[PDB]
Amino acid sequence: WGKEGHEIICKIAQTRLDETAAKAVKELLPESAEGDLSSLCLWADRVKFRYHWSSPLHYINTPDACSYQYNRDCKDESGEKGRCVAGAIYNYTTQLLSYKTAAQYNLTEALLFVSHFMGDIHQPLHVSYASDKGGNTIEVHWYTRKANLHHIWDSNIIETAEADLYNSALEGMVDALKKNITTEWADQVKRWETCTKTACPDIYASEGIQAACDWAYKGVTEGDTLEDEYFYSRLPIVYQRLAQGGVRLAATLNRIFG
Ligand SMILES: *[C@@H]1O[C@H](CO)[C@@H](O[C@@H]2O[C@H](CO)[C@@H](O[C@@H]3O[C@H](CO)[C@@H](O)[C@H](O[C@H]4O[C@H](CO)[C@@H](O)[C@H](O)[C@@H]4O)[C@@H]3O)[C@H](O)[C@H]2NC(C)=O)[C@H](O)[C@H]1NC(C)=O
Ligand SMILES: *[C@@H]1O[C@H](CO)[C@@H](O[C@@H]2O[C@H](CO)[C@@H](O)[C@H](O)[C@H]2NC(C)=O)[C@H](O)[C@H]1NC(C)=O
Ligand SMILES: *[C@@H]1O[C@H](CO)[C@@H](O)[C@H](O)[C@H]1NC(C)=O
Ligand SMILES: [Zn+2]
Ligand SMILES: [Zn+2]
Ligand SMILES: [Zn+2]
């Protein structure tokens, strides 16, 4: 996701932390954050080159098919196993288990990475085809503007919804997502939070590629103009994935710090 998606996910998550997790997050955040996790949920994107080793950790590349397997797909351009967003989530959640224990890692970074990557693993086109670079090479128009399909999913759909209903800001969208988490999707939310291991990234990635095939890629050809029909039909999936991301980020931090 772009800025708006990560902010939404982290705002939802921080309000769903239990007391012990809320305290740990406040302690691990720098003073400059003023206690707001969402103010740093794009930090990972800014260190893609400062920490070049981190760039493959934002996504998963799959073959041209609608399936994800950790062993097959979680690896970077040198084939190094684990170097994908799922592997990163396992890494940084494990690191955070070390908070306040008697026993090398910067746990502020671990928090910022897990927060961002929990978001990215929910963007459908972050678990999609290597052959089109997760939709980055699929050039279309979003209404009147040229854009690639990946960018439409990272940013354009959310921003257009913001402008359509929420006066070009994310607060109204956040409150509507929270409303639905409580009153429309309560049953689902309980399932989203369930994880028998730290975290369950492979579950999230498998959902993501299914969404990529069913919703993101579906019906789209190079050069198409995506407009109201695509926007209105895909918006609910975006809402679902943002809500899942926020719910799962909170549930994961609650497990880690409890
Ligand atoms: C789990 O989280 C940790 C902490 O963020 C993260 O560890 C980092 O791993 C990278 C490598 O993946 C380390 O970067 C290396 O640093 C060493 C020396 O400090 C350098 O020599 C390396 O440069 C060589 O290797 C590169 C290949 O990675 C080449 O491209 C390059 O040309 C050089 O030959 C490299 O920069 C980094 O230091 C650690 N940091 C810490 C604190 O351990 C780890 O990758 C995460 N794993 C996941 C998410 O799977
Ligand atoms: C733990 O990691 C964070 C993030 O990398 C470090 O905070 C950064 O520190 C650098 C250098 O002092 C500054 O330029 C940035 O302003 C800081 N970023 C943030 C988000 O706070 C922190 O210093 C690290 N702790 C260590 C290395 O002990
Ligand atoms: C909330 O759910 C209602 C009813 O299903 C739906 O009309 C609305 O679009 C949803 N809003 C969000 C932000 O998901
Ligand atoms: Zn993102
Ligand atoms: Zn992206
Ligand atoms: Zn990212």
Swiss-Prot record:
**EC number, as in UniProt:** 3.1.30.1
- Residues holding a divalent metal cation 3: 1, 6, 120
Q: List the Pfam families hit by this protein, alphabetically.
A: S1-P1_nuclease (PF02265)
List the propeptide region positions.
251-258
* Cofactors named for this entry: Mn(2+); Ca(2+); Zn(2+)
- What does the PTM comment state? N-glycosylation is required for enzymatic stability and activity.
Q: Name one GO biological process term.
A: DNA catabolic process
Which keywords does this chain's UniProt record carry?
Calcium, Disulfide bond, Endonuclease, Glycoprotein, Hydrolase, Manganese, Metal-binding, Nuclease, Signal, Zinc
Task: Kindly list the GO molecular function terms attached to this UniProt entry.
Answer: double-stranded DNA endonuclease activity; endonuclease activity; metal ion binding; nucleic acid binding; RNA endonuclease activity; single-stranded DNA endodeoxyribonuclease activity; T/G mismatch-specific endonuclease activity
* Keyword check for Cell inner membrane: no
Q: Which residues bind a divalent metal cation 2?
A: 126, 150, 154
What is the entry's stated biotechnological use?
A: Can be applied to high-throughput detection of single base mutation.
Q: Which residues are glycosylated?
A: 91, 106, 180
Superkingdom of this protein's organism:
Eukaryota
Regulation of its activity: ssDNase activity is inhibited by the divalent cation chelator EDTA and the reducing agent DTT. Divalent metal ions (e.g. Ca(2+), Mg(2+) and Zn(2+)) and DTT represses RNase activity. RNase activity is enhanced by EDTA. Also repressed by vanadate (VO(4)(3-)) and phosphate (PO(4)(3-)) by occupying the active site.
Family the UniProt entry places it in: Belongs to the nuclease type I family.
Subunit arrangement? Monomer.
From the Swiss-Prot or TrEMBL record, give the protein name. Answer: Endonuclease 2
| Organism name | Arabidopsis thaliana (Mouse-ear cress)
Report the gene name.
ENDO2
